[PDB]
Amino acid sequence: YRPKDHGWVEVIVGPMYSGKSEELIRRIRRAKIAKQKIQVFKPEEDVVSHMGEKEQAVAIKNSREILKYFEEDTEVIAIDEVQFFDDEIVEIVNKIAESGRRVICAGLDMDFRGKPFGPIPELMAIAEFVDKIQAICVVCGNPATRTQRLINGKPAFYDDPVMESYEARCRKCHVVPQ
Amino acid sequence: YRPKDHGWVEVIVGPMYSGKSEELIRRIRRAKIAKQKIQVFKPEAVAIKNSREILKYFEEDTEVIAIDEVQFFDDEIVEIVNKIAESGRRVICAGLDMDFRGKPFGPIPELMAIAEFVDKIQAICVVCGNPATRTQRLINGKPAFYDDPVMESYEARCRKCHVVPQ
Ligand SMILES: Nc1ncnc2c1ncn2[C@@H]1O[C@H](COP(=O)(O)OP(=O)(O)O)[C@@H](O)[C@H]1O
Ligand SMILES: Nc1ncnc2c1ncn2[C@@H]1O[C@H](COP(=O)(O)OP(=O)(O)O)[C@@H](O)[C@H]1O
Ligand SMILES: [Zn+2]
Ligand SMILES: [Zn+2]
């Protein structure tokens, strides 16, 4: 599988602190050891993980800029914090994969309300590889799959726009008052 | 993990022939061996129409709810499934992730987004032998065009081998 000049899209998703950046960095370093030219992208320049490690990346204001900074020489494209890019990133990523290159996307699957977040849903449907990873619930210790938003130390309301903190929780402990 | 009365949603996706039904059926037999009451639904073992009709047939006695061919249900399915999981029960969904054009199929994107477990499985490409991730629609043995409405056949293919003229 994965023969040369055959492209695909792989996605890494989960709540905050699930380890998306850590994993993205892991795959980035492996590609480099494999001697494959790779370009890393992040929104508005290093991709950093809460656990320590970091990798050089090119910050970009929007999805379109990917094609602008894209060098035909690169074999692997890595994109972090994907939940913030507009929906055009989907066709852009699909196009890169169709061109015979590998695209690695990492990002939140849901927002603090537990609702499908941005492009990730569509990216998961079209990607050849999907890895949904879990964090640990700071409340009970079981695997956390939701990001809990807190204001003054208490759960934020559903219809609450954007003193405030975030933490990973499981479905049971995640609280979203509406 | 996933102890008593802790519910969740698990999804099984992939192209035709990837093995979704086989996997779903396997999980249903396992739950039965675990002595768990299970109810099965389809877009029409309990065939049904829309998604709001699941709540109707739903017996509070059941611990596991299986939904096959999920990509055919309306978007309400997402809410219902989440609700069943929120009530402490297990929901197993199986469905195509993309249509023949390779476009996200129905509520699949949103279900994968909210699901705790996501398994994307592959078939074998009848053209080259590599893992197949797409469903190829054929009319008279030729690739169906991008804008073709509903001899016709389907087969699993690799990304490279999938052909969708536009
Ligand atoms: N609740 C938590 N669950 C798991 N890891 C946590 C948690 N809180 C802090 N961490 C630490 O933070 C790291 C988060 O990885 P990171 O890649 O930055 O996450 P993500 O990009 O998914 O938000 C973990 O490897 C762990 O050492
Ligand atoms: N191209 C193919 N790739 C893989 N399996 C195939 C293919 N064509 C036929 N099969 C057979 O069909 C079975 C498909 O499983 P099934 O659960 O019916 O698929 P799905 O529900 O995903 O459409 C396989 O286990 C295999 O024996
Ligand atoms: Zn918890
Ligand atoms: Zn093929």
Swiss-Prot record, chain B:
A single BP term in Gene Ontology: DNA biosynthetic process
Active-site residues annotated for this sequence: 69
Domain of life, per lineage: Bacteria
Cellular location(s): Cytoplasm
An MF annotation (GO) of this entry: thymidine kinase activity
Binding annotation for ATP: 14-22, 68-71
PROSITE patterns for this protein: TK_CELLULAR_TYPE (PS00603)
Residues at which substrate binds: 100, 154
Pfam families attached to this UniProt entry: TK
Binding site for Zn(2+): 125, 128, 158, 161
GO cellular component: cytosol
Main location: cytoplasm
EC number(s) stated in the UniProt entry for this protein: 2.7.1.21
Cysteine disulfide partners in this protein: none
Keywords, ordered alphabetically: ATP-binding, Cytoplasm, DNA synthesis, Kinase, Metal-binding, Nucleotide-binding, Transferase, Zinc
Enzyme class: transferase
Catalytic activity: thymidine + ATP = dTMP + ADP + H(+)
SUPFAM superfamilies for the chain: Glucocorticoid receptor-like (DNA-binding domain), P-loop containing nucleoside triphosphate hydrolases
Family designation: Belongs to the thymidine kinase family.
Protein name: Thymidine kinase
Annotated organism of origin: Clostridium acetobutylicum (strain ATCC 824 / DSM 792 / JCM 1419 / IAM 19013 / LMG 5710 / NBRC 13948 / NRRL B-527 / VKM B-1787 / 2291 / W)
Organismal lineage: Bacteria, Bacillati, Bacillota, Clostridia, Eubacteriales
